[PDB]
């Protein structure tokens, strides 16, 4: 009943004024994660469905959050798990989303991972942590690819 009332109120807040929810989205999920770590599928799905109307906004929040957290930031592993589960749970109603996400993850994965492996072979708990990060993101990519069962060729064909 709590989040039912909440989400209904939010859709009322949104339907008049187009921009508002799109303005504060990453802080949203961060505070949500803090709340969950204070308390203790598809919980975030309602906002995700709501923010799917605008193409640029859709690309925007996703690219910002995904790239900032994974590549260079020492984000909490629990936070990474939370965001990863939310991303996997997300319902997809088009084809742009999996191709876009897969494309960018691949690129960053490539560069970061390559650097990582060459520096470890050339040469370390810091390595353990950042490696855990990169491997979880890898596994997200793989699970996604299994969820669609599409050939890497078709994905790389998309630009």
């Amino acid at each position: 009943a709590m989040r039912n009332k909440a989400d209904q109120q939010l859709v009322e807040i949104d339907k008049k004024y187009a921009g508002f929810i799109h303005m504060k989205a990453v802080a949203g999920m961060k505070m949500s994660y803090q709340v969950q770590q204070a308390i203790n599928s598809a919980l975030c799905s309602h906002l995700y469905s709501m923010i799917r109307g605008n193409r640029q906004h859709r690309r925007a929040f996703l690219i910002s959050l995904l790239n900032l957290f994974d590549d260079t930031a020492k984000t909490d592993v629990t936070m990474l798990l939370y965001i990863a589960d939310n991303l996997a749970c997300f319902p997809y109603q088009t084809q742009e989303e999996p191709l876009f996400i897969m494309h960018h993850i691949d690129i960053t994965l490539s560069v970061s991972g390559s650097n990582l492996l060459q520096s470890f072979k050339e040469s370390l708990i810091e390595f353990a942590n950042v490696s855990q990060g990169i491997l979880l993101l890898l596994m997200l990519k793989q699970h996604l690819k299994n969820l669609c069962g599409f050939s890497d060729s078709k994905i790389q064909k998309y630009s």
């Binding site: 691949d106 690129i107 490539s110 560069v111 390559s114 790389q156």
Partner: peptide
């Protein structure tokens, strides 16, 4: 730089698959 690095990495993967296919042949 990012586009071209991605291109090169994927090409290395393909040619690795090629050498695997070569060893099979």
């Amino acid at each position: 730089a990012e586009e071209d690095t991605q291109f090169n990495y994927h090409r290395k993967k393909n040619i690795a698959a090629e050498r695997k296919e070569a060893k099979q042949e």
